Amino acid sequence: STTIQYNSNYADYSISSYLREWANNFGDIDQAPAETKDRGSFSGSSTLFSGTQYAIGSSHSNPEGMIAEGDLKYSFMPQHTFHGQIDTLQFGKDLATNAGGPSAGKHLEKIDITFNELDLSGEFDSGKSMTENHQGDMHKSVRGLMKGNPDPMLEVMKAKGINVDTAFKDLSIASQYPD
Ligand code: HEM
Ligand SMILES: [Cl-]
């Protein structure tokens, strides 16, 4: 089952109210100056467009970041589809590069919310249209977030049985990180 750990400072937020605020501070990547644009960084397979970790900070010089872990793949040109399976999704601020450099992964210095066993997946077929491939849950939810829009991620979570309006302290699948 999907479970959540959250920082106590977010006890009164819901998943929806947390992602509203994270997404507006992250900002839309398509609106960002090409000089501060962070498209994200894959690590784990010593390659550029796949790996076991995908980490992305804000393109609008704000501290907000997001990290996904699983079996992660990105088709780049021409359909630009993120697919595979996300097992862990983590939100917070202050995205730092591990001592081994970008190829050794990144970590959030301030961790706000972690989804465990998210089972967020999507498939990619080069023989289909970009619009069909862009219907995969994984793709549309992460892409929405990159664009400052949390609504597709929230729709995915509702369809999985998660109430995105319940406060974290009242959510039966959520545990606070220890003081
Ligand atoms: C290291 C990771 C990534 C890099 C280096 C990267 C790089 C790029 C570049 C250079 C373009 C411009 C393509 C062109 O000029 O033809 C592009 C487009 C695009 N990327 Fe990525 N990208 C990355 C990750 C992702 C992820 C994870 C997603 C989805 C969640 C994504 C979705 C898109 C989309 C949808 C476009 C086309 C713009 C649009 O139709 O909205 N990218 N990417
Ligand atoms: Cl991008």
d(CA 40, CA 17): 24
Residue 118: which of 52, 162, 58, 176 has the closest Cα?
162
- Which CATH number is 1-179 given? 3.30.1500.10
Q: Cβ < 6 Å from ligand 1: which residues?
A: 39-42, 74, 77, 80, 82, 139, 142-143, 146
| DSSP per-residue letters across 94-108 | EEEE-TT-GGG-EEE
| DSSP per-residue letters across 52-87 | EEEEEE-SSS-SEEEEEEEEEEE--TTT--EEEEEE
Elucidation technique: X-ray
Q: Is 125 helix (H, G, I), strand (E, B) or coil?
A: coil
Question: Which amino acid is residue 139, in one-letter code?
Answer: H
d(CA 105, CA 109): 13
Domain boundaries, the chain: 1-179
Among 30, 39, 72, the mutation site with the greatest number of ligand 1 atoms within 8 A of its Cβ is 39
To one decimal, the resolution in angstroms is 2.2
CA 38 to chain centre: 14
Among 50, 52, 71, 80, the mutation site with the greatest number of ligand 1 atoms within 8 A of its Cβ is 80
CA 133 to centroid of ligand 1, rounded, Å: 14
